[PDB]
Enzyme design. Structure first.
Site, PDB file in Angstrom:
ATOM      1  N   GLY A  76       0.880  -1.143   0.000  1.00  7.31           N
ATOM      2  CA  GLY A  76       0.000   0.000   0.000  1.00  7.31           C
ATOM      3  C   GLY A  76       0.915   1.190   0.000  1.00  7.31           C
ATOM      4  O   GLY A  76       2.110   1.040  -0.198  1.00  7.31           O
ATOM      5  N   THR A  77       0.370   2.372   0.214  1.00 10.99           N
ATOM      6  CA  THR A  77       1.195   3.559   0.253  1.00 10.99           C
ATOM      7  C   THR A  77       2.055   3.483   1.509  1.00 10.99           C
ATOM      8  O   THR A  77       2.063   2.468   2.215  1.00 10.99           O
ATOM      9  CB  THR A  77       0.343   4.822   0.334  1.00 10.99           C
ATOM     10  OG1 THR A  77       1.164   5.958   0.076  1.00 10.99           O
ATOM     11  CG2 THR A  77      -0.286   4.973   1.736  1.00 10.99           C
ATOM     12  N   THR A  78       2.759   4.574   1.791  1.00  6.37           N
ATOM     13  CA  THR A  78       3.631   4.667   2.958  1.00  6.37           C
ATOM     14  C   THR A  78       3.027   5.549   4.060  1.00  6.37           C
ATOM     15  O   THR A  78       2.518   6.642   3.788  1.00  6.37           O
ATOM     16  CB  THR A  78       5.020   5.236   2.557  1.00  6.37           C
ATOM     17  OG1 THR A  78       5.760   4.243   1.818  1.00  6.37           O
ATOM     18  CG2 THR A  78       5.800   5.680   3.801  1.00  6.37           C
ATOM     19  N   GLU A 132       1.276   9.178   2.841  1.00  6.17           N
ATOM     20  CA  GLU A 132       1.523   9.505   1.442  1.00  6.17           C
ATOM     21  C   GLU A 132       0.248   9.247   0.616  1.00  6.17           C
ATOM     22  O   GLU A 132      -0.183   8.100   0.466  1.00  6.17           O
ATOM     23  CB  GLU A 132       2.692   8.651   0.931  1.00  6.17           C
ATOM     24  CG  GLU A 132       2.956   8.709  -0.572  1.00  6.17           C
ATOM     25  CD  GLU A 132       3.991   7.668  -1.029  1.00  6.17           C
ATOM     26  OE1 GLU A 132       4.203   7.500  -2.257  1.00  6.17           O
ATOM     27  OE2 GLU A 132       4.599   7.010  -0.155  1.00  6.17           O
ATOM     28  N   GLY A 180       4.346   0.331   4.771  1.00  2.00           N
ATOM     29  CA  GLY A 180       4.010   0.677   3.398  1.00  2.00           C
ATOM     30  C   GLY A 180       5.119   0.258   2.437  1.00  2.00           C
ATOM     31  O   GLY A 180       6.220  -0.105   2.861  1.00  2.00           O
TER      32      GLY A 180
END
Lengths: 241, 243, 245, 249, 198, 234, 243, 243, 111
Positions: free
Chosen positions: B29-31, B46, B161
């Site tokens: 996934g995102t961070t 993010e 992430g």
């Protein structure tokens, strides 16, 4: 394969489990319903093959549901006993909530209702029974005859048969029973019912049950002699031609 | 293997793969990062702008619990909101019973016990997200980071992430050259920094930064969203150092 | 080959085959035909009996929902009896609450919100019944807002409104023909000979008033199911025009 | 392997429920245990095996008191027995003592226990107990008794018998030296000489757990004043009482 | 209350039951039949609370009839009354009890003996030679204590029962609008439509 | 050889951390007709391309009301949408009777996400096969959202979903600077939506029978323009 | 491969219910039991199967049971499945007595039981009863009666029946000598005069039997039900053909 | 062909591997623990490995305080153990409430060995992959130590060990107890006993410990306490010379 | 003893003209011998050209109306914004009212 469950459709839109249940009805003994125009007559056959048993309380295949309605079947014996019970109770509950005793279609409908209810959810198995319901509605004189299948559908007939070798008996009936003019005598209406089983009975009236139902809650089983009095008179004209 | 199909099943070595795969979905996934300053903490996530048709300042990824807890996660976004609503009840009923707003450490178990549970029954799917959160209570500030197996601990600051390592090495560092609590304000600043540096894995996909924080002095015990001026500063105060 | 065994399983291309097979169950029913006209709506069906000892009227392929709505089904009969029953209760109840007649489409609506109750597992609510119904419906009715309407109900859960439509074993050829016949200015008597004609065509057996049932509904007299003598002569009167042109 | 032995609900073509027999296997594995019916008593015994001597075996019973006139032992899956026990001591009150103002006869407790044993079977979603118990006691109208209970739920009465790994022969030994007369002290004897061959460890006072049903102990009550309330017949021998009877072979 | 009499004789039971039905100030009917045949040789009269009265009667009748086709055998007076006392018995301790009193008089084709059971709404059953419910007893019981004999003919019983009614008329405040009589025996039930046609 | 033992149930993670059953669901949204939505600072708009069976059947609608200030268009399995749009109508009514405040659009997103949520975490069921574009006008003016069966609701400025939707989204992505400023005038905000939708036609062109439109904004309660009334745009 | 015998909820293409048939197959593994009708009584004879030197058998029983004070049954098949029924069979029997204040008719009791056995054959998650029964009793409706019931849920009335092992043999011999009027002491005769012929053991030993009978007459205007004791057996056994 | 997938199916040799596999998971902990009892105290030892400069060790333990007298140590995943720790932590509260007195070590362990049995026979969930070690100073047995496992087992230990190193830490003690010929450590105060374990452990592992490589707790006359961070350094010093 | 009812006075009136209809009702609102407001409406338009007023116990009144109006809303939602025939409306109000037959709305309503 797709014939493993009641909740699955085969690619061509079938549901084999229910279909196979029917294959069991064919296993049971033969039953045949024949209506006249003042009566209705049901007939069966006795699995007289392995006997050294009692006689007194031997099933007649035909059972009364109310004073004015009788029912006969073919197929899984044990399965059949529950439908007969359930229909008997309902027949009495109807009188309790509407005064009026049930109609032959209302009963047939209730039965087939049950049979269909047992093909809904899984974790249930369809009754292996097929049945013939005959009788006369309250204060009415038009003879009625319906049949129900394990699938849940019900239908009315002028005459009909179910069980093993029902294809034969049916052929016979078809070329004999006159749609335009039904047997006008209880005696001849019987005669016709008897002669039809006399193509699968394997000789003897010791293998044939006959029950007659007329209007006004008037029902009555038949005896072994009376039944033979016809096997007699029909074994005459048989070689008489 | 037939040991990676069910969620309850133990592999011959006492390994529950379904939970493991759960983690694979999280580290993609995102961070999301979590900074624990002196009194209070700082969070930042993010957000990824896929297209130009995306009203900015909208579609928030950080949720407040009660009114003193920060909360951010990475992975399956719906699973996200979910795990938090529960946390929101769990919170509320607790304050309604004891009066005193829920202890950040207590809160974590509630969440763990819950995520815990989704590893026990084979009729359900384990949570597909790693969560980072914290806030300031009676014992000051705390900062935890729960994960897909329900496992969790307290951190000085952490993140999960796709790009987390860079976030970690450039995180352990801040610890070494500051062994004595960072800085309320400064945390934010350095926060917006730690994200950029980590975004170099999405480089070709322009993004939008979101920061929130919670502090006994700047927020006043309550968790607030870093919007406005200090929000800009922190960006440039990071865009400058990015060179 | 592998994704067609679960009513709650998407095939790689987002399809629900069990539902599709469901429909394939209808093609096995005998043909049913509906044609709408600014004069009223008509419903006709092929009876198709296995034996001469059956009692025809025993096969209820066309039935009344209420004085202003009737219909013809095709597919599994037991499954039909259940929808017909729900539908009838739906109508009567609405009447009770509003002292008025249920809009044809609002009725059709409730019939579909019923099929919409398949699926076993437990992900929240609860709708007890394992699979899709194996049957479709031709609902012909009339109400003060949109006049004579004709609908097609599918176990899928959706429905369309038609000017004329056919379902069952023959819906293949029947639907083609109807595509090249129907026109807004058809009289009622005209549609009767048309429904009657297309059956005979893509039907099979010699078309007699025993293997073919015909009905219709109008503002004036509601749902009426044409008796045998009428249909009988409507057939002669029909088969005749075939001589010349 | 069959395709019928993985379902309590399934009959094999011949007519044998499966999961039951494998459950009954965990029993035919457990440590050897026996029971002998005397004329003025009954003895039930079973061996003990130490994981390591670092563990205190004197905090885990194997011969249990269900009623102060009935005790029982086992062979098979340890843990089952522990709770199957506490469920038995209750179904003994709620189902009899609390309805008849008195404790239950041997026969009926064993059946009230087989009743709980039955449930485990009839029903997919659970596994039967991997234990088989020997329950021994005595009630006024029936004299002394000896019964066996298996996962299958069935239960039978013996004069003497054994269950466990070393049972084929132990059950052979007993068969030879048993007769309607043995006084209790004799049984207590015949038992040890049979709990003898059935071991590879040792024969001290700890690794042996044996108890017996006999005469009333007007001492083991805790009160005195009521004539009829005379005492408990169940007595679990102590580490000492044992090794003494071991010296005299 | 309503009138409910019953008397067992040599070989049959006789049941008397007032005909009027009253709602408050008026009399909505003077030809009501408080009877209800449970089977070919079992008859049951009743009297009690307005609604409770026949809802119950019919219910009982339905059970007996069900049992009878099922078994194809006829349940006996003794066992029939037993069933009734069972229901009423459970009734008294329920959210709302039926307030119905009854009389059951059948012919036991097995012993060839007539039997009459009297049961009150509480579940109190007793076998008697003659009985009555409510206030009906005080005006009659003495006359019957006096003349009743077990050897009596059906023909004699009626004459007796006539006297009891004549007394009920002379000293009872309510005008019950006459009674309807019925006889149960080896041949079944029939109505003495001549105590009314007199 | 070459199976995929990880796509049988919504309740199973593939080795990489993917939920295939949910993925297949989206695939069904792609198979449905197209629909477009775009908004300025005074209105929001839904433009949909109704589909049909025969030249005898009717075109199946895809615009749904929810309150005087809210609505959506759909793509995919019709029934699922019904259930969803319905759950939405309910949520708004509660927030109306009890508090007497019009349900904000963002909230309607969370709600539709958390409901779609449940169906990706439990055994026995299947995920909703349908995408929706919601529009509305709360106390923050215009609003547009895009929900997918995975529970992902994103707030855009415009967009389209359905077969060939692609082209229309492209168009919208350019004309952006232009329409985002079409304030005070609805007739132009719709002509824009209609242009954008035509970028996705291949079979026919939009006729009065298959075109549906809907708007809502400042002084325009959610209303739907059907057939003979959308003629001035064809 | 692939077979239709995996459960009770499934019809084979030919409408067979295998699972039920297999249960019906479990009976041929039980000790033989016989029931013979008589002009004045009914006889129940069984042959203990299980055996071992040290097996108490003079007190407890295993095949013959009293259900009513006027009805008795012979068991054959799954021991536990037998008790579950026998008990309910006893409760039902008492409710009839408690409701009609009369004793329950034989056929009614046999039918009630067969109706339960029927039910475990039609519902999922259930396994049919692996039992068979020979009911012997008397009621004022039909005098003495002999009934039989299997796992499939069907029942029937014989004049002389056998169930269990070597039914073919036992059944055959009877079919031969049974005189339709045969008095009681001739049935008890024929009991062994059949059980003997169809055993294995070097010799038929008393401790391996179970007898019971039902007699009545003018004397006790009611029925006397006897369950023979080890003694009476070892005796009447010698009076016949054993040293 | 999946015995070992279901927690309810017996292998042909009555095995139930799922329960077995449960165990290996009790090892992937990689922490060792031994507990020994004094004369009026009880002490458990366990290593405290913190492989991350980010995790703040304060929140990194495997020993919790069930009640104000009982302490517990767990050889398994922090998620699962955190669960058990809670149930038991509650059984305590309720027991007291329902009986008037504080719940004994020996008992709580039986509620758990039972709880994790029903847990395992009814199949309402997967068995927890951990081993629980219960310590306390009972008022009817003082130095008490009981340990339950996943299979629903338990018993008393005069002092035991658990981890990837059973035998070592174990045998090492069997030879030390093989001498003293008694079943307990002799000493007037805990302080000294503590020193005895660390002492008698480094011996088996072969490694030095600091004020962070270990972790210990002890039980007094009704007052369970966890050893301080800095304070653990103490006895470590005192016993670094009296070699 | 808690008594759940109260009377807030008021009077309403409804006349049906040849091709129009009226429905009036004073604005005073009371409690015992005091005043709660000299202007508090008790006559509302409910949509689809239907006026309604429920007079008696203030609260039950507000409740019924609200409950009725939310009902007009859904009648549209389910039958294509179809208009509610005033007759169809009264039939509906019946069910609403009879809904609470055993804990009645203490009011006399008029549409």
């Amino acid at each position: 394969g797709y014939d493993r469950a009641l909740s699955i459709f085969s690619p061509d839109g079938h549901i084999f489990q229910v279909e196979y249940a029917l294959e069991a009805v064919k296993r049971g003994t033969c039953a045949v319903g024949v209506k006249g125009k003042n009566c209705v007559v049901l007939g069966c056959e006795r699995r007289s093959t392995l006997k050294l048993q009692d006689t007194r309380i031997t099933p007649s295949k035909v059972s009364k549901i109310d004073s004015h309605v009788v029912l006969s079947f073919s197929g899984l014996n044990a399965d059949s006993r529950i439908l007969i019970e359930k229909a008997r109770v309902e027949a009495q509950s109807h009188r309790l909530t509407l005064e009026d005793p049930v109609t032959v279609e209302y009963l047939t409908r209730y039965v087939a209702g049950v049979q269909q209810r047992y093909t809904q959810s899984g974790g249930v198995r369809p009754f292996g029974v097929s049945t013939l319901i005959a009788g006369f509605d309250p204060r009415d004189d038009e003879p009625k005859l319906y049949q129900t299948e394990p699938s849940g559908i019900y239908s009315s007939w002028s005459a009909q048969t179910i069980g093993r070798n029902s294809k034969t008996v049916r052929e016979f009936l078809e070329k004999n029973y006159d749609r335009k003019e039904p047997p006008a005598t209880v005696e001849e209406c019987v005669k016709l019912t008897v002669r039809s089983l006399l193509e699968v009975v394997q000789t003897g009236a010791k293998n044939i049950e006959i029950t007659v139902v007329k209007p006004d809650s008037d029902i009555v089983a038949l005896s072994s002699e009376e039944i033979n009095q016809y096997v007699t008179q029909i074994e005459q004209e048989k070689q008489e031609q | 293997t037939g040991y990676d199909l069910s969620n309850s099943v133990f592999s011959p070595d006492g390994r529950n793969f379904q939970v493991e795969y759960a983690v694979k979905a999280v580290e993609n996934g995102t961070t999301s990062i979590g900074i624990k300053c002196n009194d209070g903490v700082v969070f930042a996530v993010e957000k990824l702008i896929t297209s130009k048709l995306l009203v900015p300042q909208k579609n928030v990824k950080i949720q407040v619990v009660d009114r003193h807890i920060g909360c951010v996660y990475s992975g399956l976004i719906p699973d996200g909101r979910h795990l938090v609503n529960r946390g929101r009840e769990e919170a509320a009923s607790f304050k309604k019973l004891y009066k005193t707003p829920i202890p950040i450490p207590a809160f974590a178990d509630r969440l763990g016990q819950y995520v815990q549970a989704h590893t026990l029954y084979n009729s359900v799917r384990p949570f597909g997200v790693s969560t980072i959160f914290g806030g300031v209570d009676k014992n000051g500030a705390h900062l935890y980071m729960l994960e897909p197996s329900g496992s969790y601990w307290g951190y000085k600051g952490a993140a999960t992430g796709k790009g987390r390592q860079s976030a970690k090495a450039e995180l352990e560092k801040l610890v070494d050259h500051h062994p004595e609590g960072l800085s309320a304000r400064e945390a934010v600043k350095q926060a917006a920094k730690i994200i950029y540096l980590a975004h170099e894995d999405n480089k070709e996909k322009d993004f939008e930064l979101e920061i929130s924080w919670c502090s006994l002095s700047e927020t006043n015990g309550l968790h607030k969203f870093v919007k406005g001026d200090l929000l800009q500063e922190a960006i440039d105060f990071a865009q400058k150092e990015i060179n | 080959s592998e994704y067609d065994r679960g009513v709650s399983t998407f095939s790689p291309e987002g399809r629900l085959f069990q539902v599709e097979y469901s429909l394939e169950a209808i093609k096995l029913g005998s043909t049913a035909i509906g044609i709408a006209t600014k004069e009223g709506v008509v419903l006709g069906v092929e009876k198709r009996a296995t034996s001469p000892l059956l009692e025809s009227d025993s096969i209820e392929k066309i039935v009344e929902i209420d004085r202003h709505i009737g219909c013809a089904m095709s597919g599994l009969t037991a499954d039909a009896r259940s929808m017909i029953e729900h539908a009838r209760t739906a109508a009567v109840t609405h009447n009770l609450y509003y002292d008025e007649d249920i809009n044809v489409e609002s009725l059709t609506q409730s019939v579909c919100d019923l099929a919409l109750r398949f699926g076993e597992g437990a992900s929240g609510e609860e709708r007890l019944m394992s699979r899709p119904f194996g049957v479709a419906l031709l609902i012909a009715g009339h109400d003060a807002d949109d006049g004579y309407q004709l609908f097609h109900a599918e176990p899928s859960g959706t429905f369309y409104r038609y000017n004329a439509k056919a379902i069952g074993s023959g819906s293949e050829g029947a639907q083609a023909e109807l595509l090249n016949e129907w026109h807004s200015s058809l009289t009622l008597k005209e549609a009767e000979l048309l429904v009657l004609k297309i059956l005979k065509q893509v039907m099979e057996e010699k078309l007699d008033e025993n293997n073919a049932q015909l009905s219709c509904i109008t503002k004036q007299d509601g749902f009426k199911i044409y008796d045998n003598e009428k249909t009988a002569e409507l057939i002669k009167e029909l088969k005749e025009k075939e001589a010349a042109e | 392997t069959d395709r019928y032995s993985f379902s309590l609900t399934t009959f094999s073509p011949s007519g044998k429920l499966g999961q039951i027999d494998y459950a009954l296997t965990a029993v035919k594995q457990g440590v050897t245990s026996l029971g002998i019916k005397a004329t003025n008593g009954v003895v039930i015994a079973t061996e003990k095996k130490s994981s390591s001597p670092l563990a205190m075996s004197e905090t885990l019973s194997k011969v249990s008191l269900l009623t102060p006139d009935i005790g029982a032992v086992y062979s098979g899956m340890g843990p089952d027995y522990r709770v199957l026990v506490d469920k038995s001591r209750k179904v003994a009150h709620t189902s009899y003592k609390r309805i008849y103002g008195e404790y239950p006869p041997t026969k009926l407790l064993v059946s009230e226990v087989a009743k709980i044993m039955q449930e485990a079977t009839q029903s997919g979603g659970v596994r039967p107990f991997g234990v088989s118990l020997l329950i021994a006691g005595h009630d006024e109208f029936n004299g002394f008794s000896l019964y066996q209970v298996d996962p299958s739920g069935s239960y039978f009465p013996w004069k003497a018998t054994a269950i466990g790994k070393g049972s084929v022969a132990a059950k052979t030994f007993l068969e030879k030296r048993w007769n309607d007369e043995l006084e209790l002290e004799d049984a207590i004897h015949i038992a040890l000489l049979t709990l003898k061959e059935s071991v590879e460890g040792e024969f001290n006072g700890d690794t042996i757990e044996l108890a017996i049903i006999g005469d009333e102990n007007p001492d083991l009550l805790g009160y005195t004043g009521i004539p009829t309330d005379k005492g408990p017949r169940f007595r679990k021998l102590t580490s000492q009482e044992i090794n003494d009877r071991l010296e005299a072979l | 209350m309503d009138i409910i009499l019953g008397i067992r004789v040599q070989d049959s039971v006789i049941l008397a039951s007032s005909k009027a039905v009253t709602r408050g100030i008026s009399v909505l009917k003077d030809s009501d039949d408080k009877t209800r045949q449970l089977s070919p040789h079992t008859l049951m009269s009743f009297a009690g609370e307005a609604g409770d009265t026949v809802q119950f009667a019919e219910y009982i009748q339905a059970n007996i009839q069900l049992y009878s086709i099922r078994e194809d055998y006829e349940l006996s007076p003794q066992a029939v009354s037993s069933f009734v006392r069972q229901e009423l018995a459970k009734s008294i301790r329920s959210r709302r009890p039926y307030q119905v009193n009854v009389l059951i008089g059948g012919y036991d084709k097995k012993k060839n003996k007539p039997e009459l059971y009297q049961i009150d709404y509480l579940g109190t059953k007793v076998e008697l030679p003659y009985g009555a419910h409510g206030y009906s007893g005080f005006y009659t019981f003495s006359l019957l204590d006096h003349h009743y004999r077990p050897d009596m003919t059906t023909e004699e019983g009626l004459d007796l029962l006539k006297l009891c009614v004549q007394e009920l008329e002379k000293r009872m405040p309510m005008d019950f609008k006459g009674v309807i009589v019925k006889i149960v025996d080896k041949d079944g039930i029939r109505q003495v439509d001549d105590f009314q046609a007199q | 050889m070459f199976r995929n033992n990880y796509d049988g149930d919504t309740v199973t993670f593939s080795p990489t951390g993917r939920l295939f059953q949910v993925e297949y669901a989206l695939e069904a949204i792609k198979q449905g007709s197209v629909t477009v939505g775009l908004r300025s600072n005074t209105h929001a708009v839904l433009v949909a391309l109704k589909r049909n069976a025969d030249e005898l059947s009717s075109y199946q609608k895809k615009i749904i009301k929810c309150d005087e200030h809210m609505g959506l268009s759909l793509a995919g399995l019709a029934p699922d949408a019904r259930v969803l749009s319905n759950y939405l109508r309910q949520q708004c009514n509660y927030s109306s009777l009890v508090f007497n405040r019009k349900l904000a659009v963002e909230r309607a997103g969370h709600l539709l996400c958390d409901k779609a949520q449940k169906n990706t975490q439990s055994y026995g069921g299947r995920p909703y096969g349908v995408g929706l574009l919601i529009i509305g006008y709360d106390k923050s003016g215009a609003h547009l959202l895009e929900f997918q069966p995975s529970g992902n609701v994103t707030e855009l400025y415009g967009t389209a979903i359905g077969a060939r939707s692609q082209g229309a989204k492209t168009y919208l992505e350019r004309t952006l600077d232009t329409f985002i400023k079409i304030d005070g005038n609805p007739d132009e905000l719709i002509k824009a939506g209609v242009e954008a939708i035509s970028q996705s036609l291949r079979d026919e062109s939009l006729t009065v029978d298959n075109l549906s439109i809907a708007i809502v904004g400042k002084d325009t309660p959610f209303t739907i323009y059907d057939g003979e009334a959308v003629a001035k745009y064809i | 491969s692939r077979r239709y015998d995996s459960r009770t909820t499934i019809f084979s293409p030919e409408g067979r219910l295998y699972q039920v048939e297999y249960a019906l197959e479990s009976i041929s593994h039980a000790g033989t039991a016989i029931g013979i009708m008589a002009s004045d009584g009914i006889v129940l004879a069984a042959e203990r199967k299980v055996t071992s030197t040290l097996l108490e058998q003079d007190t407890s029983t295993e095949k013959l049971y009293k259900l009513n004070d006027k009805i008795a049954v012979a068991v054959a098949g799954l021991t536990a499945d037998a008790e579950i029924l026998i008990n309910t069979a006893r409760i039902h029997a008492q409710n009839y007595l408690k409701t009609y204040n009369e004793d329950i008719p034989v056929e009614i009791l046999v039918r009630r039981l067969s109706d339960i056995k029927q039910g475990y054959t039609q519902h999922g998650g259930l396994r049919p009863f692996g039992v068979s029964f020979i009911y012997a009793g008397y009621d004022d409706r039909y005098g003495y009666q002999l009934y039989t019931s299997n796992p499939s849920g069907n029942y029937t009335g014989w004049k002389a029946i056998s169930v269990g092992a070597n039914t073919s043999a036992a059944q055959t011999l009877l079919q031969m000598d049974y005189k339709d009027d045969m008095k009681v002491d001739d049935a008890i005769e024929l009991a062994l005069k059949t059980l003997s012929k169809t055993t294995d053991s070097s010799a038929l030993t008393y401790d391996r039997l179970e007898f019971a009978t039902i007699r009545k007459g003018a004397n006790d205007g009611e029925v006397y039900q006897k369950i023979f004791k080890p003694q009476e057996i070892k005796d009447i056994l010698v009076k016949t053909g054993i040293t | 062909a999946g015995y070992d997938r279901h927690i309810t199916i017996f292998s042909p040799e009555g095995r139930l591997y799922q329960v077995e596999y449960a165990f290996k998971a009790t090892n992937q902990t990689n922490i060792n623990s031994l507990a020994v009892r004094g004369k009026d105290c009880t002490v458990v030892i366990s290593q405290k490995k913190v492989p991350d400069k980010l995790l703040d060790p304060t929140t990194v333990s495997y020993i919790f305080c069930i009640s104000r007298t009982i302490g517990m140590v767990v050889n398994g995943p922090i998620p699962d153990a955190r669960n058990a720790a809670l149930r038991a932590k509650a059984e305590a509260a309720e027991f007291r409430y329902k009986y008037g007195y504080d719940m004994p070590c020996d008992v709580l362990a039986k509620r758990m060995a039972n709880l994790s049995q029903i847990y395992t026979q009814r199949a309402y969930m997967r068995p927890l992959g951990v081993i629980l070690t219960f310590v306390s100073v009972d008022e009817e047995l003082g130095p008490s130590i009981y340990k339950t496992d996943p299979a629903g087992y338990y018993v008393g230990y005069k002092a035991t060990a658990t981890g990837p190193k059973q035998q070592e830490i174990t045998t090492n003690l069997e030879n030390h107890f093989k001498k003293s010929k008694i079943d307990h450590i002799n000493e007037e105060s805990w302080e000294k006993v503590v020193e005895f374990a660390i002492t008698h452990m480094i011996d088996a592992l072969g490694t030095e410990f600091s004020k962070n490589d270990l972790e210990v707790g002890v039980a007094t006359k009704d007052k369970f306490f966890t050893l301080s961070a800095e304070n653990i350094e103490e006895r470590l010093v005192a016993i670094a010379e009296q070699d | 003893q808690f008594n759940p009812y109260g009377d807030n006075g008021g009077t309403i009136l409804g006349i049906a003209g040849e091709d129009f209809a009226v429905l009036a009702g004073d604005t005073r609102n009371i409690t015992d011998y005091s005043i709660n407001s000299r202007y508090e409406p008790k006559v509302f338009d409910c949509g689809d050209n239907i006026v309604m007023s429920a007079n008696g116990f203030a609260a039950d009144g507000d409740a019924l109306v609200k409950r009725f109006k939310n009902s007009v809303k859904w009648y549209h939602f389910d039958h294509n914004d179809k208009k509610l025939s005033i007759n169809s409306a009264a039939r509906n109000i019946q069910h609403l009212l009879y809904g609470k037959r055993f804990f009645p709305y203490y009011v006399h309503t008029i549409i």
